[PDB]
């Protein structure tokens, strides 16, 4: 039904789960989001999430893309990520190479405020904080990107496009009604094929709103209102991973 999740609806439905933004930052978001969508070539830019930090200047992260094709049996989005301490001015997040991608997963802890911070590892390796910031966003999006099933379909030239005739998913409480965004529409891969205890779903049968929370990544929330057929997701908190999931459950 919808073609792009809203910023007001996501911030409204996820307010209960603590996924909220500063009131001043909310006002700046309404103005500077369309500006960044035109300065860059992106045609669909939304707010991916907000990562906390040792200071009060949380990293507001926005994700946008132009083309979304299907190659090697997996739908790939040429996503572009932007970061901003406040909602006024956005900067860009460059991708990182494989050698740094392995040396950034060992830096556990909480990110600092100034994006010009360098961490040290072992000879000494100097890694910028923005590289660490990009790694955590990529790791979270790899395992948590959740969209309703059959919401995207394949057309000619192998492009995944929104299903304009989507009629919603029956039994929204079941995990089989949601799939990863990079899963091909034909493939029957859903959140059920993941680890059994990773995802928990709380569905309000009366108001027709469902909430999906990741236990592997506790800061990720996704909602899906069946009545109005709107879905959106956001991430709050740090981007660390819950390694010892077996003990928690």
């Amino acid at each position: 039904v919808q073609l792009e999740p809203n910023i007001t609806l996501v911030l409204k439905h996820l307010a209960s789960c603590g996924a909220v933004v500063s009131a001043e930052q909310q006002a700046a978001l309404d103005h500077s989001i369309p500006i960044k969508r035109i300065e860059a070539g992106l045609r669909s830019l939304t707010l991916w999430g907000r990562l906390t930090t040792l200071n009060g200047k949380d990293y507001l992260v926005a994700e946008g893309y132009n083309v979304a094709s299907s190659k090697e049996g997996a739908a790939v989005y040429e996503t572009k990520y932007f970061y901003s301490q406040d909602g006024a001015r956005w900067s860009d997040l460059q991708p990182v190479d494989s050698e740094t991608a392995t040396r950034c997963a060992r830096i556990k802890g909480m990110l600092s405020g100034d994006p010009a911070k360098n961490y040290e590892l072992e000879l000494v390796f100097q890694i910028p904080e923005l590289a660490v910031l990009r790694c955590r966003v990529d790791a979270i999006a790899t395992a948590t990107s959740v969209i309703p099933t059959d919401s995207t379909i394949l057309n000619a030239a192998s492009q995944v496009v929104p299903n304009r005739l989507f009629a919603g998913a029956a039994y929204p409480e079941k995990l089989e009604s949601y799939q990863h965004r990079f899963s091909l529409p034909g493939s029957g891969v859903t959140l059920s094929q993941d680890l059994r205890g990773t995802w928990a779903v709380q569905y309000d049968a009366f108001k027709g709103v469902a909430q999906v929370r990741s236990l592997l990544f506790p800061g990720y929330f996704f909602y899906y209102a069946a009545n109005e057929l709107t879905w959106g997701s956001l991430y709050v908190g740090d981007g660390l991973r819950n390694n010892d999931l077996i003990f928690m459950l």
Binding site: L54, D86, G109
Partner: protein, 51 residues
């Protein structure tokens, strides 16, 4: 890093330090989701999140 993080971190309500009436507070790092806010004579503490 070799510097242990502090247990509490500041939280602001505006990106400008010249706002006339801006609320400010602290946020606990040991227990995530615990916040304290203060504006003049009105102070409050609240814990929302996972225990």
């Amino acid at each position: 890093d070799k510097v242990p993080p502090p247990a509490w971190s500041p939280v602001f309500a505006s990106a400008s330090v010249t706002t006339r009436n801006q609320v400010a507070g602290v946020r606990s790092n040991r227990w995530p989701g615990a916040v304290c806010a203060c504006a003049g004579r009105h102070f409050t503490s609240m814990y929302v999140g996972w225990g």
